[PDB]
């Protein structure tokens, strides 16, 4: 009778989740978009004022790509000429419009081809990379003071990471830190000179006669990787006349033996800075806090000050080392670690003294700190009904550990199971985004008392819309392997009927610290598969998953593509026998390393999985970056994990997949994962007969994000699926 | 109740088809190898005698790939670590045998990689290519004499040609040639500097950690060309004086007013060589006719022994001008060129005069010419029975015109329409080899009488097999179009009973002066194809096709992609008249060219076809090769014939596939049609949203012959029609 949720409503948006995006620019202001006309708001009574018309650059002459208001709002950075790179990184064209006297200024402005642009943390000072070169802006209009000259596009990168930084490390393409009121610009450096360069062809438009070869400086594991080096330099002492000194920050002496990175950088006040280093061998990290010595014009490192994060199970920290939260004074500072259980719970620090106190502890760890007066600590955390996969805000009385305060957990229990938050400058207020597994509910509160001001989003339009079309249904319950529970998530159809027999696809990415069962609510492709297609879709978090602990996280450490495979297997046969799933019909796909699940799964022999689909997986491990693979791989050598690197390989299993239906897709201008490693899945299923099929995708990234690139992919997995369980 | 020509059968070789592969040594004596060991045979009587005892390089230490025995029989070159490259060329290791001392020559050996090498035509010289330098051995155990001091990797030939001389104009890998005696040594050199580099990435073995990038000089329609020099030298005066000489021949001035081409080298007597120039517009070429000069020491060449050769209806040549065939006494020629009619035949030259006399006329045309003797000239045509899909060996006598005696006509006329010819070195006996539509014959016959002196391989055993097996049946008739007929050919399954309706595959290459349809027997994917899943398989020589005259070869000069487009489907349509095919199930698929019509039939519109597959297409004309596609499609500029070019591209009629089921595969190390050239078709049907199937082969060249691949390709292709037809 009603319309089911179709592919077509997937890839179109005939259902958009409504957000509430909100910049706090005050202690109690923020600034959200509205009718392309950007309003300002208070927090408390939650009254308006139109900031920027959003007729004001109606014949600007370019599409505005986006807007960063200064610290004290005396000018508005205009983002233009936006040209995407890596999942992070961009080239852009500025402007910058001083916001009274209402002119865009004209004298010195920010060159075309702008790697990356930053105000101060206050006031209006740029700081701006352009040929890998930091410079420096005090005014809008002023020239710029060139802080470094050793800019050279591939080789040397100042004040931005590279390849692999900026994936792997610093989840951006910025490497500059200011100081809390922009005295001290601090800044790292990477040169990837001997680095190995990963080469693939780009096609561009139909009319580029010859194909261009991109070639990018990536290491892979066991490779050369880049080195860098941290300076910082005095944004207030700058000539006009002559060239900055920026002093150089050497790491530690237990860092500087091997081969090792930079993993985090925080200003703890306005003269003191704290540097994490971490080792090649990712088990071992330091923590350094750099004091600034005002005669010397040195900064100097007290060793008594240095603190060590190792792991004898595994890496240190989740995907790296967590980054610590300063008090006001900066004597002490608060970080995530894991205990002695092996959970990562909340530590405090004295900046001089080697123990940590932790002030939380338990069966559950802790997402983030969220917020830090001088009272409390917020943090949001997934302790609440002992469920990991759902995430909740608190707080701890930092004067009385055992007063914490679930400031989201009752709030309604029923919609909301996971939080995210985002705390105004003294977090004043509050805004709560619960995310599922209700419709998006957005929310406003003030910390005083923990009164929920307003509701500032509830997608009741949506909602009355998705009331006319048969929704699938969720369910999220475990299974108990070994005394030890894994969550898994069911996406089940709307009349779900137990009485009958389901289709079933197992859902996978079952990376490292990942987590693929939770609380939240989706519209993606599963919503249809299950709706439409009446085809159950799972998802397991096993041996791997995060959110839970050491013993099972580091549970595949060097083992990579060993008992997170299993565990797939396992928890598909589990089902494979629930009477309403048909074992005839059950598949799994998977993307990325879950690509590498589903490949590594269909060639296992378990006889459990009829057909899969696997995208821009991960063939072997030598072929991805070093940061990553040997974090959990360890080094490609015989002295180290060469064996387990060599057995881990998709392609020394390709005669077990003539017992399954596959499909390879990858985009062969794939950066993260490089075509060469499906390229060389096919090879082996070519030398050893089996039949699969395939499908490239010209240009396309790890993303395959192209919009038609993107409605052709899913449209050809569905075909896949439907052919596959026979469904009409 | 006898099984079927099966898919297995023809990937796995189940019926061998045998041949007789024969080398002269001699006017009557020929080396032929008979389980594994070099046998001599005599024409006159067919005693015979072991001449290389197989078991003789058993203690060798390395598998032997070829062997190659000097003119004299003196000496035999053993070649081995065969490493292919492109069509022809390809890089070895080799060895000399001193057949008399029966000993293997260890001094001054062979370089390792020599990429060439030949034996002169007389006694035991040899002259290798090494790193594109010549090198030139008068004894196999002596030092070599370096030719050429120019030679350089990707940028100067010597000896050898580069890419588009390799593929587009010599056919061959080596670019030097031996005078009749072996006096002197000729040699093209090549420099493409200024060529643009084809870049394709090569991902090796599974070892490879880092993908490898082919960079190849390669000129794509338009771009720039590689230029070409020519020069002699006299081997036999290498050991009195320094350093060797090479005394440089010239192209006429008509050629270096612009871009040109070298395009025949022959050799006519001891002293006189003939060269022929075409112009980068390929519709005219010269001839020049060279004399060394004992008094000058160079090589003069007098302009009243110029011939030039143009077309007014296209280009020249069927793929390049014809070469010549001159008396002993070298002062005339003859040569195949297109008549007054558009057919072509060969006629008489004199060397000093420029009208030249046909000595063969009508509506057919001779293939080639086989030898020439002092009384007789000998021809293949395919006169006979005005059938231009056969083949027969002809007789004419020199003194007579009128006296022309068929040598192979009335053999054996149901079993042999098909034949092609080796003569001994004076033409004192001739190997006649039928080659269908029966199964393959060879015989050997005595010039003197051409009475036939007996069988060499008669299949007998093979026809022995067959008789127990559902093999199809061939039929070659024609239809007719604006008063002009085109000739067919179509696999029809056993037991064919035209009252039914059967499905048609439509085999397609449509390449200019391309000859599909024709009488020669098979045994191919068609085979099965018939023979198995009952599917009648037929392919069309229209506008475009060759050996028929130049108003049908020339008919799409300039027109790439449409009169031999626009006409296979008009035979689909021709063929569904008639009655036993099944409208509803009608594919096409082709490779190369073929590949490329496929899919522009697909996008035509036509609502013809249901579907069809491409194996490694050309796309757009301006990203193939220059001397081919610029040899039809003329230059891709506007002031040229630019619109043509974009205006029959497939990526315009991607829309169109909408209508149709596709499947584009292609190997991703293909050099000729590069990998570009899908990757561009697959972008443009993604960007229209329509879906298709793709398969992709890691390292496969243009031919995707790998074994296992080869077993793939044809394996992935076979379920694609079956789904198609629904056979199952
Ligand atoms: C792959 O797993 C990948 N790429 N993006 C993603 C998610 C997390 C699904 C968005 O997964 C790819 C192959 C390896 F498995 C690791 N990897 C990465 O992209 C690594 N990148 C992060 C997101 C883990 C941190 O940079
Ligand atoms: C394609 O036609 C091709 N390559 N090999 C072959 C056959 C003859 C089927 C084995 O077809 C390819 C694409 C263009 F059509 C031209 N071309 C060539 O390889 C070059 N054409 C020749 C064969 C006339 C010269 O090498």
Redesign the interface.
């Known amino acids: 009778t009603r319309k089911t949720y179709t592919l077509t409503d997937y890839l179109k948006n005939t259902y958009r989740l409504k957000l509430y995006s909100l910049r706090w620019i005050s202690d109690h202001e923020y600034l959200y978009k509205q009718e392309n006309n950007i309003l300002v708001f208070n927090a408390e009574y939650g009254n308006s004022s139109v900031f920027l018309e959003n007729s004001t650059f109606d014949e600007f002459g370019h599409s505005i790509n986006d807007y960063s208001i200064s610290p004290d709002g005396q000018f508005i950075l205009l983002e233009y000429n936006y040209v995407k790179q890596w999942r992070h990184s961009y080239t852009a064209s500025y402007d910058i419009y001083d916001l009274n006297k209402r002119q865009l200024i004209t004298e010195e402005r920010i060159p075309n081809n702008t790697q990356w642009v930053t105000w101060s943390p206050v006031g209006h000072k740029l700081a701006y990379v352009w040929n890998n070169d930091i410079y420096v802006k005090i005014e809008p209009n002023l020239p710029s003071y060139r802080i470094t000259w050793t800019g050279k596009e591939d080789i040397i990168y100042n004040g931005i990471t590279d390849w692999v930084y900026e994936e792997e490390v610093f989840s951006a393409y910025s490497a500059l830190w200011w100081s809390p009121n922009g005295t001290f610009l601090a800044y790292a450096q990477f040169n990837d000179t001997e680095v190995?360069?990963?080469?693939?062809?780009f096609?561009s438009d139909?009319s580029l006669?010859?194909?261009?070869?991109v070639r990018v400086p990536y290491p892979?594991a066991?490779?050369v990787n880049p080195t860098v080096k941290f300076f910082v330099v005095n944004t207030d002492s700058l000539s006009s006349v002559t060239n900055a000194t920026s002093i150089q920050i050497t790491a530690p002496a237990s860092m500087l033996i091997g081969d090792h990175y930079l993993c985090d950088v925080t200003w703890a006040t306005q003269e003191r800075i704290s540097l994490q280093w971490l080792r090649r061998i990712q088990n071992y990290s330091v923590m350094d806090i750099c004091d600034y010595d005002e005669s010397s014009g040195r900064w100097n490192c007290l060793v008594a000050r240095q603190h060590i994060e190792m792991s004898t199970t595994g890496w240190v920290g989740r995907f790296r080392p967590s980054e610590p939260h300063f008090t006001l004074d900066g004597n002490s500072f608060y970080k995530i670690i894991s205990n002695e259980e092996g959970y990562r719970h909340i530590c405090y620090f004295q900046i001089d003294k080697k123990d940590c106190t932790f002030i939380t502890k338990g069966t559950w760890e802790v997402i983030g700190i969220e917020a830090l007066t001088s009272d409390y600590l917020y943090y949001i955390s997934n302790e609440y009904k002992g469920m990991p996969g759902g995430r909740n805000l608190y707080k701890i009385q930092l004067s009385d550990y055992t007063k914490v305060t679930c400031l989201s957990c009752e709030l309604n229990p029923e919609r909301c199971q996971y939080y995210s938050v985002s705390f105004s400058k003294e977090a004043k207020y509050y805004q709560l985004r619960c995310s599922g597994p209700g419709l998006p509910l957005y929310t406003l509160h003030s910390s005083v008392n923990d009164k929920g001001l307003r509701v500032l989003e509830d997608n009741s339009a949506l909602d009355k819309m998705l009331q006319n079309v048969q929704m699938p249904s969720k369910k999220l319950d475990f299974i108990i392997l070994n005394e030890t529970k894994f969550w898994y998530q069911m996406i089940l159809p709307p009349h779900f009927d137990k009485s009958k027999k389901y289709p079933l696809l197992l859902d996978v990415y079952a990376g490292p610290c990942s987590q693929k069962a939770d609380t939240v609510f989706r519209l993606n492709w599963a919503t249809y598969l299950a709706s439409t297609e009446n085809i159950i879709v799972a998802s397991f978090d096993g041996r791997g998953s995060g959110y839970q602990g050491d013993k099972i996280m580091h549970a595949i450490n060097r083992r990579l593509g060993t008992f997170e495979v299993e565990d797939q297997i396992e928890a598909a046969r589990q089902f494979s026998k629930m009477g309403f799933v048909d074992n005839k019909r059950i598949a799994i796909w998977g993307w990325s390393y879950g690509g590498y699940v589903t490949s590594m799964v269909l060639g296992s022999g378990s006889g459990v999985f009829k057909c899969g689909i696997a995208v821009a997986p991960v063939?072997?491990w030598?072929?991805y970056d070093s940061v990553y693979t040997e974090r959990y791989m360890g080094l490609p050598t015989p002295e180290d994990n060469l064996d387990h690197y060599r057995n881990s390989?998709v392609?020394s299993r390709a005669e077990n997949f003539k017992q399954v239906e596959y499909l390879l897709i990858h985009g062969?201008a794939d950066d993260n994962v490089?075509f060469?490693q499906s390229?060389?899945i096919?090879?082996?299923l070519?030398?050893v007969?089996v039949?699969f099929?395939?499908?490239?995708?010209?240009?396309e990234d790890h993303g395959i994000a192209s919009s038609?690139?993107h409605?052709?992919i899913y449209?050809?997995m569905s075909?896949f699926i439907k052919q596959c369980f026979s469904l009409p």
Do not use: C, F, N
């Open positions: 190995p360069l990963i080469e693939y062809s096609y139909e006669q010859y194909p261009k070869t892979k066991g490779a063939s072997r030598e072929y390989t392609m062969t490089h060469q390229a060389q096919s090879k082996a070519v030398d007969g039949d099929q395939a499908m490239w995708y010209t240009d038609t690139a409605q052709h449209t050809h075909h």
